[PDB]
Design a protein around this ligand. Structure first.
Ligand code: YW6
Length: 316
């Protein structure tokens, strides 16, 4: 089984989940790639070669037709804006892509939407970028300063060219440790950290018109948080789990956001005593959400961090 970790990446094709990176109480080996079979519940470790990225926490990854794409993260010498690809369809080779155009600023803890040939990245925490959007310094980083951004960048996989769309509507504030989910042409984003708050707002970017929309669901809504997961489980539902509140409470609540009804529904599950923050979540083809890793308590107290290697399965 893989070692415990937080800030790792996990991506899937609905059957196999590929886990990489992260750190524990030390970064996990850069050349290792763990594969979890969602049907049998078994793990397999493989060592990769090629342009192996440095070991990082907070990288942003996606799996499209079993091609893994990785952007950003934080390694032993800070944030990066490098882009890597790993074709998981023989020893697997990582490929660092020298992209065309102006890339995003070096950052981690951001989100991505997949839409046709585009990988659309949003937000994050990193160095000052010049770029369309706004960047807000984190005053605590001055005493290389860093901050939050609300930037939207497109990486066109047809030519590996970076660009920025011109967006309309009220964008969400700059943020990092938010969660992104794509359904149809809507790039949803929920919560995240900004200034002294871990927020409770829900928005979607229309990936055809580049219009931002804020969603105000009716009734009870989940508490604001960062370091939570948000996973599409059907053409009409997003599954929310875990995170960390403004007042530093680890979370074990789970909810479904019904897109058509614009309504949250609290989901009952047997993991109430297993809160997680900075875990990953991947949907399987059988409707389940597979949660891996993350921390059970406040990971900011590094000497007491309860990093996990547990698989938590939600039958959504
Ligand atoms: O504190 C958090 O929730 C994580 C974070 C730190 C800076 O930006 C996001």
């Amino acid at each position: 089984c893989p070692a415990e970790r937080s800030g790792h990446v996990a991506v899937s094709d609905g059957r196999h989940m590929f886990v990489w990176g992260g750190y524990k109480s030390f970064y996990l080996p850069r050349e290792e790639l763990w594969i979890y079979n969602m049907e049998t519940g078994r793990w397999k470790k493989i060592n990769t070669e090629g342009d192996v990225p440095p070991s990082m926490s907070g990288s942003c990854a996606v799996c499209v037709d079993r091609v893994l794409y990785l952007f950003g993260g934080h390694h032993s010498r800070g944030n990066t804006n490098k882009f890597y690809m790993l074709d998981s369809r023989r020893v697997l080779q990582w490929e660092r892509i020298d992209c065309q155009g102006i890339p995003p600023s070096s950052k981690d803890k951001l989100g991505v939407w997949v839409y046709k040939n585009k990988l659309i990245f949003f937000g994050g925490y990193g160095y000052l970028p010049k770029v369309l959007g706004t960047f807000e310094f984190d005053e605590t980083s001055f005493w290389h300063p860093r901050g939050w951004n609300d930037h939207v960048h497109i990486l066109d996989t047809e030519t590996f060219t970076w660009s920025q769309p011109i967006t309309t509507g009220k964008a969400p504030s700059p943020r990092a440790a938010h969660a992104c989910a794509t359904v149809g042409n809507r790039g949803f984003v929920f919560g995240g950290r900004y200034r002294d708050a871990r927020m409770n707002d829900l928005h979607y970017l229309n990936l055809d018109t580049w219009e931002w929309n804020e969603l105000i669901p009716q009734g009870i809504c989940p508490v604001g948080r960062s370091w939570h997961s948000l996973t599409p489980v059907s053409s009409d539902h997003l599954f929310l789990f875990g995170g960390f509140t403004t007042d530093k409470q680890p979370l074990s609540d789970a909810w479904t956001y019904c897109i058509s009804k614009n309504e949250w529904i609290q989901f009952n599950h047997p993991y109430t005593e297993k809160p997680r923050l900075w875990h990953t979540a991947c949907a399987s083809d059988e409707g389940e959400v597979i949660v891996f890793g993350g921390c059970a308590n406040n990971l900011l107290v590094h000497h007491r961090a309860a990093h996990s290697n547990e698989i938590l399965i939600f039958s959504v």
